């Protein structure tokens, strides 16, 4: 198992506490510098957009065609669909969607699907940013695995729509879907890179500590390097 050694070697460069989890539908595997992160709960931050889009489309609070118009209050200073907002990571668009859903519906939907600790507190548009909603990397990886397979408790066409919002690139006929996250409001700060590769499916979740001034592109660069070494997503 020199593949594992090659992966671990990648993390010898990274000074931050990091775990990388993979899920192929049967096996959970863990790599990185602090493996206990995989079973620790952190705020989902921008990764919550996935569940937010799902709940919203499911409950007729938006469509994938609808334009969320900018209200003129100051980057993200333009009109976005939910898909455009996903890849741009436009928080205010998804805050608006959260406010359309409302605390009662949000709470019951998170409970219904068993997302993380299923806690929203009192602010319906901040709970994934400041807490108290938390989720383990293992939970995230299983979540996005089911999304890829269309086996979440949502309408099939809803899952397909949200799934394709996460599309990043393809190599041959292998497809990468991914969503990054950087929770700055919490201490310590958490970084996410969650997604999956469609050949069979391999879901993955990078989860690591972040500090002000860190390289924003590190999460993706690291994950792609890991996926290549695993042979899950080879470089072209």
Binding-site residue set:
46, 49, 89, 180, 182, 219
Q: Does 131 bind ligand Y33 (CB under 6 A)?
A: no
CA 211 to chain centre: 19
Q: Does 91 bind ligand Y33 (CB under 6 A)?
A: yes
Q: Does 16 bind ligand Y33 (CB under 6 A)?
A: no
Contact assessment for residue 183 and residue 42, using Cβ atoms and an 8 Å cutoff: yes
DSSP annotation of 68 reads: B
- Residues sharing a CB contact under 8 Å with residue 42, sequence separation 6 or more, in sequence order: 134, 135, 136, 137, 183, 186, 190, 207
Rounded to 5°, the CA angle 199-51-161 comes to 55
Instruction: Tell me which stretch binds ligand Y33 (CB under 6 A): 55-63, 64-72, 110-118, 177-185.
Output: 177-185
Instruction: Give me the residues paired with residue 206 across strands.
Output: 20, 193
Q: Does 195 bind ligand Y33 (CB under 6 A)?
A: no
Q: Residues in the chain, how many?
A: 236
- 104 catalytic? Reply is no
Q: Does 133 bind ligand Y33 (CB under 6 A)?
A: no
Shortest Å distance, C-beta 157 to ligand Y33: 27
Contact assessment for residue 62 and residue 82, using Cβ atoms and an 8 Å cutoff: yes
Shortest Å distance, C-beta 88 to ligand Y33: 9
Q: Does 32 bind ligand Y33 (CB under 6 A)?
A: no
Hey, which residues are catalytic here?
46
Question: Which spans of this chain sit near ligand Y33 (rule: CB under 6 A)?
Answer: 45-46, 89, 91, 129, 180-182, 216
């Amino acid at each position: 198992s020199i593949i594992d050694q090659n992966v671990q070697a990648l993390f010898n460069e990274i000074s931050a506490d990091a775990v990388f989890v993979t899920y192929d539908g049967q096996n959970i595997k863990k790599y990185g510098t602090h493996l206990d992160r995989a079973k620790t709960a952190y705020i989902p931050a921008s990764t919550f957009k996935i569940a937010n889009a799902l709940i919203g489309l499911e409950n007729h609070k938006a469509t994938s065609t609808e334009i969320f118009k900018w209200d003129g209050k100051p980057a993200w200073d333009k009109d976005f669909t939910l898909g455009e907002a996903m890849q741009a990571s436009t928080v205010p668009v998804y805050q608006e969607l959260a406010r359309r859903i409302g605390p009662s519906l949000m709470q019951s939907e998170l409970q219904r699907i068993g997302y993380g600790n299923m806690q929203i507190g009192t602010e319906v548009d901040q709970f994934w940013l400041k807490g108290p909603l938390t989720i383990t990397p293992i939970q995230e990886v299983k979540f996005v695995y089911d999304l890829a397979q269309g086996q979440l408790p949502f309408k099939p066409e809803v899952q397909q729509q949200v799934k394709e919002m996460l599309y990043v690139e393809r190599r041959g006929e292998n497809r990468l879907y991914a969503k990054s996250g950087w929770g700055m409001a919490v201490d310590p700060q958490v970084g996410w890179y969650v997604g999956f590769v469609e050949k069979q499916v391999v879901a993955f979740a990078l989860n690591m500590q972040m500090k002000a001034g860190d390289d924003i592109a590190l999460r993706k660069q690291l994950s792609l390097d890991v996926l290549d070494k695993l042979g899950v997503f080879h470089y072209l």
